[PDB]
Amino acid sequence: ARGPKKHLKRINAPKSWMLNKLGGIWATRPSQGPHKLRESLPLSVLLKERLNYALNGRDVTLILNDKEQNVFVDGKVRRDKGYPTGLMDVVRIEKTDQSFRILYDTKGRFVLKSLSKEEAKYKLLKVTAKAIGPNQIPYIVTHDSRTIRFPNPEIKIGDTLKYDLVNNKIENFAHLESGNVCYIQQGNNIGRVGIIQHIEKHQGSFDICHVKDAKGNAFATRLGNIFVLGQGKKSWIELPSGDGVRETILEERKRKFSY
Amino acid sequence: RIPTLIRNGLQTKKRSFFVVVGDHAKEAIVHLYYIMSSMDVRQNKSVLWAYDKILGNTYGMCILQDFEAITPNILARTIETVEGGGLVVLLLKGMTSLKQLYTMTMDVHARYRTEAHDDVIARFNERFLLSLGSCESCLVIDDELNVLPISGGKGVKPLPPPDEDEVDQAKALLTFVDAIAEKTLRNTVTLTAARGRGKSAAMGVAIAAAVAYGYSNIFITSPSPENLKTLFEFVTIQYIRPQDAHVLGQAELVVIDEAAAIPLPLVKKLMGPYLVFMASTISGYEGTGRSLSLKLIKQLLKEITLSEPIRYAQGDNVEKWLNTLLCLDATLPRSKISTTGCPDPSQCELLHVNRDTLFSFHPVSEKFLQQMVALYVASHYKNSPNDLQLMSDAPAHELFVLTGPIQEGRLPEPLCVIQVSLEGKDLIPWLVSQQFQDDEFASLSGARIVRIATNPDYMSMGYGSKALQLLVDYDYVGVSYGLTQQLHKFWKRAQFVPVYLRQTANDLTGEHTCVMIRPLQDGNDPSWLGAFAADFHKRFLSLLSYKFREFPSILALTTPFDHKRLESYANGLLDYHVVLDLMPTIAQLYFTGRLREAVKLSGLQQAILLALGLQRKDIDTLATELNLPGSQVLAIFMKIMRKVTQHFGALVSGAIAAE
RNA sequence: GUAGUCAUAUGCUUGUCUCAAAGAUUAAGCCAUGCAUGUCUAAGUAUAAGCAAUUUAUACAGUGAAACUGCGAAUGGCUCAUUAAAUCAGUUAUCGUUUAUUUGAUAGUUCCUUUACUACAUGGUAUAACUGUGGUAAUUCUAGA
RNA sequence: AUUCAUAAUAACUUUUCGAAUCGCAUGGCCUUGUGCUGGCGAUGGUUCAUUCAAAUUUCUGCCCUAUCAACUUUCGAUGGUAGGAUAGUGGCCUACCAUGGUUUCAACGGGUAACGGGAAUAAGGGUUCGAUUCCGGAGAGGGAGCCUGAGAAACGGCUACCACAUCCAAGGAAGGCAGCAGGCGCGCAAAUUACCCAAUCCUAAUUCAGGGAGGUAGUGACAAUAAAUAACGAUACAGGGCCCAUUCGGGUCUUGUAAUUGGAAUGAGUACAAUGUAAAUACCUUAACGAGGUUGGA
């Protein structure tokens, strides 16, 4: 192909953005950042269609360009129409001191969870890779594309850390092993939260995992899609749509219109 | 406005002079832009801008930029090129200021005057104003004229309608031309006319009209080329120039275009072997004087003349304008228009008059100078307005006239005229220093006798010398002429001393041009004369051999300097022949030089220097051997000269190169 | 047979209402006429009132002219014309290959001259732009100051 | 999984590296000039992975055909190897040789103008989608070579060549819009060279650049739809009716006013802002203000 793509089509932009089909023809294309294209929510989407603080396109252009700084992502200022806010992030709306979790539904739509000045401090990080680099030093990396220097050594590659944004400090981690709580970042099963049952590795190039939860449903997904929302039953963050558990179309009806 | 008028003009086949006078930018430039868009004989016009190559073509509309300078020849030539409905837009300086205009502003075209700075030329402006002012024919648009009245044009305005314009040649082609009779059929015909008459076209007709097989085959010759294009285009025409022409005799009817230009010797011989049509232009710029034309004809002639222009209708006011401005009119040789005229009888009286005569119009007025001009101009082989302008405005112009009986305001015509042109401080004052030894020669002053002429009826009276004596009577005097044993003695008898004999036969006369000086002041002029004369003495052998014609230099009569000359060729631009001949300084140098004088050194282009100078090898020949591109040959010759000088004396050459 | 043709067939022609289609289809007939990827300051370059437009930073205000920049101008968009080919689909990580983009991170060992290291009160240039001098049927022309 | 790293390690590399940034923030520190104080970013570099990628790449699948039997090896048909290219994998080649091996499961091979093909519901049914190809290779006179660069087999960069193919003061000096429209043509076949970048998308340098995106129209049975547009009623006056199959019988009985009543029927203009082309935003939707004239048979 000519070179590298550079736009994005209304029609082609993820169902996670709950986008306007009739809308236009395009859609703000996520900027190369911390999260992958599909797994992200560009700010313009976050304020216009989400919060609804903005509206028309120029509305954003003001907000992120205005010399006041109205948007914060993980304790930092952002002024990019399409910064890819990803899973388990913390976004603050300066002018109102609003704090949000970037989390998927139970139906897989990006949801905004309101946090208390309390959780707004800690953010959950999942461990990408772990190896030693320059001059005998250990480095850990998080999905959030965080690069960590001198990390606690009791941390295996597929771990989950709790991060104190305020001090850029770590605390209480927890690997994925039979008996923990987890969130699935993507898949025919995303947005779910349950107890890890067991992890059968097949090495041939793809390991799998099982899970249980509230109504004790059986879940199946690939490791790469498991995010440890916590150690031993206690979750670490407040979940959207009540608990991370979806209902039969049948259970939804009976709960709402009670059929 | 003028666009309507333009329509009338092309319909009439006439042209008009549109004078734009005013500020350079204001009237001149902007108006020209507007006129181009507006005036459309066709859509717009070619509007060639002039500020020789152009003649075969014709153009609708043109502009002549006299704002700084006026070259009259160019103006006349430009007009001849313009088609029917065309307008010649003359760009002039502000009208009130024009006459004086020229000074600091100056007539830049002053190449006639050739003072360091250009000057006024008021007289010419005055003559111009007279012709322009005389009648309604020329349109004068002056600045600060919010509205200019345009006589003529759409609506009723001044310009009496001429008939739509659209036999003389036909009467002439075969017709006057059928040369068969008790008298010989083979003879020489000479058709003469002003420019644009159709002489060439007439001459072209005969070419085919005689058919190869059929009427017969023809031939054609001409001087330095001249537009061969019309004749042949109108035409078996083949062309071999006269000299090359001298080869073999094939044809029944020879045609020579503007033969007057060709040497009498060469021309005469050629006319003998066949039957010919002789064409010659007169009564215009770069034409031939009618006085000379008669002498030329006498050498034979069936002469015929064509009166009407092919390109425009007769009576074209533009053409009338230029003729009058330029003083095209010839009448004095046959006769003057008055009680007197024609031969000038009575005792000849010698007198001088100044340029000032030009302004006054009374006794001694524009007329006296005009008459003098007509006479000298008439007697010359070629006529040119540069002469006229020079006569009018140029400083340092002095005249002497030989006149017949003078009494009342109107008397008989002049017998003779002498035009002296100060020179110093072209021709006698440009070359004495390039060609001679003293770098300084250009500095002094002298008066060249540009033109001397005695009415043919009056000749051999001694009036000619009488004219010269009057010139001296009340640094030196000089003259340049085609060398003739006869003419030289005239000048020698005049008291001139032979200065130089150049290399190239006059293209027109066929004789080599010599220069002579009549020493007025001893301080340096007799010195320059004698010194040059001596130099010529040393050079004499060199010249004779070089001439090819190898004519010995009688002239009017029955070294360290060489080093300077040599350096000038080596270090500078002086030309080869100047240094070279068989043996001027250059051959002198080769004899002495141990170097390649032979195959490489000596003096000239070929073996670089020797092969051309000694061998007389062709430029083309040595360029090949030497493997030079051409032009480079001269450079090599110069380099060779430098080398020889250095070998002779390094220190001397260095100083000479330096200063 | 039946007429009809709920056959057309086109062949005749009339309030208020719109989710609203129209030289890929022929030849992958192209440029009439119309037309055309450049650009900004917290930010890199502007005149001690000849960019200069004010106005009085004031040793460098804006303010911009122009340039320098520095960027994209490998994007598409129309085009099978091909193509029986992995084209393409899945279906490969690439111990086999390259990588702007984006972050993240981030870098004490440069002498050690035999520290006038000079001494960094951070170098040198170079140039435009710029004033001008031009040229030429005439350039995205171009000359030379 | 490593000869992996990231180690070193020496050497030895015309080889790097390494903010002569600018921006506000200069008030705290001591000093008192000082030394700082740099704050903070802008402006860099560094390598790594950071998406960016591509780029390979196994592993299923184009029409028919055995009347395809056989195929493929001079340098590749194979292996394997030396190198060299390749940016970097590769017979890709330099070699150098291996003879390879493909194949009736038809292989060699042939023949199908072939450019080329995503959603979801759903007892059953209901239905439907993405939107004229999601997907996805090869053209931008011919040829050539070259171009940018993170990044082109660079169409729309060149050149130069060819060709066309053009302006001309003679001289030189053009020019390839299947990214549009347009006229020819073609000639099967279809609307002004609308309005805006109002969105929503685009690019993009620190803003609000620019967006031939997009949008908006119109045109436009286009396919069209819709299917709703003079009747409601006052009176008189009354001939007798008027129909039948009718042949005569029968049926019985309003019917004409080219008579006199009905509401301030209604249509059409006028602010009317406007979902509204922030301008289409008066054209919508209002609102009102006003305001009825085929046939046959003499």
Supply the DSSP string of B520-570, one letter for each residue: --SSSHHHHHHHHHHHHHHHHHHHHHHHSS------S---HHHHHHHHHHH
**How far is the C-alpha of B559 from the C-alpha of B539, rounded, in Å?**
12
Q: Which nucleotide is nearest to A40 (CA to C1')?
A: D51
Encode B41-63 in three state secondary structure: CECECCCEEECCCCCCCCECCEE
Q: Are strands A137-142 and A122-133 parallel, antiparallel or unpaired?
A: antiparallel
Q: What is the largest CA-CA distance in chain B?
A: 87
Long-range contacts of B485-489 (CB under 8 A, 24+ apart): B485/B554, B488/B514, B488/B516, B488/B554, B488/B555, B488/B556, B489/B556
B462 is in an annotated binding site: yes
Please report, in angstroms and rounded to a whole number, the separation of the first and last CA atoms in chain A. 54
On strand C, nucleotides with any atom < 7 Å from a protein CB are 42, 73-76, 92-93, 100-105, 107, 109
Q: Which nucleotide is nearest to B47 (CA to C1')?
A: D169
| Distance from residue B402's CA to nucleotide D27's C1', rounded to whole Å | 108
Tell me the two tokens of residue B556. 């009017």
SS3 state of residue B576: helix
A184 and A191 Cβ atoms separated by less than 8 Å: yes
**How far is the C-alpha of A225 from the C-alpha of A246, rounded, in Å?**
17
* Residue indicated by tokens 């006085």: B291
**If you count them, how many residues does chain A have?**
259
Characterise B444 by phi-psi region: left (phi > 0), alpha (psi -120 to 50), beta (else): beta
A61 CB inside 7 Å of strand C: no
Beta bridge partners of B50: B64
B37 is in an annotated binding site: no
* Residue indicated by tokens 């992890």: A199
Amino acid at the residue B192: T
| Distance from residue A133's CA to nucleotide D23's C1', rounded to whole Å | 36
| Distance from residue B96's CA to nucleotide D34's C1', rounded to whole Å | 80
Q: List all residues 6 or more positions away from A37 whose beta carbon is below 8 Å from its beta carbon.
A: A29, A30, A84
User: In a 10 Å sphere around its CB, with 0-12 CB exposed, 13-18 middle and 19+ buried, how is residue B50 labelled?
Assistant: middle
Half-sphere exposure of B516 (CA within 13 A, CB side): 24
**How far is the C-alpha of B417 from the C-alpha of B397, rounded, in Å?**
13
**How far is the C-alpha of A184 from the C-alpha of B191, rounded, in Å?**
115
Please report, in angstroms and rounded to a whole number, the separation of the first and last CA atoms in chain B. 65
Q: Where are the extended beta strands (E) located within B177-217?
A: 188-193
Kindly write down the DSSP assignment for every residue of chain A, as one continuous string: --S-----BGGGS-GGGT--SSS-SB-PPPPSSSS-SSS-EEHHHIIIIII-S--SHHHHHHHTTSTT--EEETTEE---TT-EE-TT-EEEEGGGTEEEEEEE-SSS-EEEEE--TTGGGEEEEEEEEEEEETTTEEEEEETTTEEEES--SS--TTEEEEEETTTTEEEEEEE--SS-EEEESSSTTTT-EEEE-------SS--EEEEE-TT---EEEEGGGEEEEESTT--SSPPSSSSS----HHHHHHHHT--
The DSSP element (H or E) to which B379 belongs, if any, is helix B366-379
B190 is in an annotated binding site: no
Q: List all residues 6 or more positions away from A25 whose beta carbon is below 8 Å from its beta carbon.
A: A9, A10
B433 and B413 Cβ atoms separated by less than 8 Å: no
**How far is the C-alpha of B419 from the C-alpha of B387, rounded, in Å?**
10
**How far is the C-alpha of A215 from the C-alpha of A219, rounded, in Å?**
12
User: How many other CB atoms are found less than 10 A from the CB of residue B212?
Assistant: 11
What are the C-alpha distances in Å from B132 to residues B18, B136, B140, B627?
Answer: 10, 8, 8, 60
Alpha-carbon torsion (B172, B174, B179, B180), positive or negative: negative
**How far is the C-alpha of B31 from the C-alpha of B21, rounded, in Å?**
10
Method of determination is cryo-EM
Instruction: Report residue B112 CA to chain centroid gap.
Output: 12
Amino acid at the residue A58: R
B658 is in an annotated binding site: no
Among candidate residues A111, A124, A99, the one with its CA nearest the CA of residue A182: A124
SS3 state of residue B377: helix
Among candidate residues B142, B17, B170, B14, the one with its CA nearest the CA of residue B83: B14
**How far is the C-alpha of B391 from the C-alpha of B400, rounded, in Å?**
12
B4 and B39 Cβ atoms separated by less than 8 Å: no
B200 is in an annotated binding site: yes
Q: Which nucleotide is nearest to A139 (CA to C1')?
A: C105
**How far is the C-alpha of A55 from the C-alpha of B175, rounded, in Å?**
101
Q: List all residues 6 or more positions away from A104 whose beta carbon is below 8 Å from its beta carbon.
A: A16, A87, A110, A111, A185, A186, A190, A191
Which stretches of B242-313 are DSSP H helices? Answer: 242-245, 264-271, 290-298
B328 and B193 Cβ atoms separated by less than 8 Å: no
Among candidate residues A86, A72, A73, A74, the one with its CA nearest the CA of residue A16: A86
Amino acid at the residue B31: H
| Distance from residue B247's CA to nucleotide D262's C1', rounded to whole Å | 130
B585 and B592 Cβ atoms separated by less than 8 Å: no
**How far is the C-alpha of B613 from the C-alpha of B606, rounded, in Å?**
8
| Distance from residue A1's CA to nucleotide D78's C1', rounded to whole Å | 35
**How far is the C-alpha of A10 from the C-alpha of A26, rounded, in Å?**
4
B196 is in an annotated binding site: yes
B208 and B290 Cβ atoms separated by less than 8 Å: no
Resolution, Å (one decimal): 7.3
| Residue B561, φ and ψ in degrees, nearest 5 | -70, -35
Amino acid at the residue B521: Q
Question: For B119, which DSSP code?
Answer: B
Q: List all residues 6 or more positions away from B542 whose beta carbon is below 8 Å from its beta carbon.
A: B580, B581, B582, B583, B584, B587
B100 and B120 Cβ atoms separated by less than 8 Å: yes
User: In a 10 Å sphere around its CB, with 0-12 CB exposed, 13-18 middle and 19+ buried, how is residue A250 labelled?
Assistant: exposed
A6 CB inside 7 Å of strand C: yes
**How far is the C-alpha of B426 from the C-alpha of B450, rounded, in Å?**
10
Tell me the two tokens of residue B656. 């000479």
On strand D, nucleotides with any atom < 7 Å from a protein CB are 5-8, 49-54, 122, 130-131, 137, 150-152, 155, 169, 198-204, 206-208, 211, 213-215, 278
B317 and B17 Cβ atoms separated by less than 8 Å: yes
User: How many other CB atoms are found less than 10 A from the CB of residue B440?
Assistant: 12
SS3 state of residue B249: coil
**How far is the C-alpha of B88 from the C-alpha of B81, rounded, in Å?**
10
User: In a 10 Å sphere around its CB, with 0-12 CB exposed, 13-18 middle and 19+ buried, how is residue A192 labelled?
Assistant: buried
User: In a 10 Å sphere around its CB, with 0-12 CB exposed, 13-18 middle and 19+ buried, how is residue B142 labelled?
Assistant: middle
Tell me the two tokens of residue B72. 């009259």
